[PDB]
């Protein structure tokens, strides 16, 4: 029924992943990682929060391979899975900014996310009605990406029917890349930390340009050049593959953004 809920609503949550203790430990490792790349500066600091954290940081590598997440995603997308990107979405204490309703798919340049992709939104902290959580628009995914603070989907969203994504630390939400969502400001004294993972099957293909992804279930990488797991935090081989993979991805992003 998990797949049925996902396909009907365009999302499904909560699904269990990390324990509270694993969530807190992961958050500590994430914070340690952020400080470290900030001190190194350069390209790691610039791309600290996206799009390939899992290729250089052991804590991110561990989560995207977590069996509970992979099992949940497999029940939605099938047994052949790849990690296409990772994102840190952090809303610090008393951050007054808001994000308009929008869909993740707009600038990803992917073909086949309609049936063969899902974003896993892992709560490293609790998500509450007041700490800047995401809201979903149920059923807003059924026509794929739509035309678009950030830019906003050109459609009227019923705010009263929107669904606050409320999670215990360690739980996650899974939503369609065409799910319309918005996020409010964090009104609390504690930062809100979420780790987002884009899972795809080999039936997803880039609209244009060379692309890469990390095989996590199955043996088929489709059109994607294969990536590798980091042997250790900031291992030089991982850094070199990171530079290559991020450069490849940002070329794609730059290209789709140009075709607005």
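-> sequence recovered:
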């Amino acid at each position: 029924d998990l797949a049925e809920r996902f396909r009907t609503d365009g999302f499904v949550f909560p699904v269990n992943a990390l324990t509270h203790a694993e969530a807190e430990q992961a958050l500590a490792e994430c914070q340690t990682y952020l400080r470290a790349v900030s001190a190194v500066g350069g390209a790691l600091a610039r791309y600290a929060a996206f799009p390939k954290i899992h290729l250089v940081a052991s804590w991110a590598d561990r989560i995207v391979h977590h069996p509970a997440i992979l099992d949940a995603v497999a029940s939605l997308l099938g047994p052949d899975l790849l990690v296409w990107s990772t994102n840190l979405f952090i809303r610090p204490a008393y951050s007054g900014s808001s994000l308009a309703w929008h869909q993740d798919a707009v600038y990803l340049g992917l073909d086949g996310y309609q049936q063969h992709a899902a974003r896993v939104w892992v709560a490293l902290t609790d998500t509450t009605i007041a700490n800047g959580t995401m809201r979903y628009a149920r059923g807003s995914h059924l026509h794929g990406a739509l035309p678009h603070r950030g830019e906003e989907i050109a459609v009227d969203i019923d705010e009263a029917a929107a669904v606050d994504v409320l999670l215990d630390a360690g739980q996650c939400s899974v939503h369609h890349l065409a799910m319309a969502h918005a996020s409010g400001p964090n009104q609390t004294d504690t930062g809100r930390f979420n780790f987002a993972i884009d899972y795809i099957t080999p039936r997803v293909s880039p609209t244009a340009g060379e692309d890469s992804a990390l095989l996590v279930r199955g043996t088929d990488t489709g059109a994607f050049l294969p990536e590798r797991r980091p042997e250790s935090d900031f291992d030089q081989a991982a850094l070199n593959d990171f530079y290559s993979a991020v450069t490849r991805r940002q070329k794609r992003i730059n290209q789709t953004v140009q075709n607005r």
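The domain at 2-258 is CATH 2.60.120.620 (Jelly Rolls).
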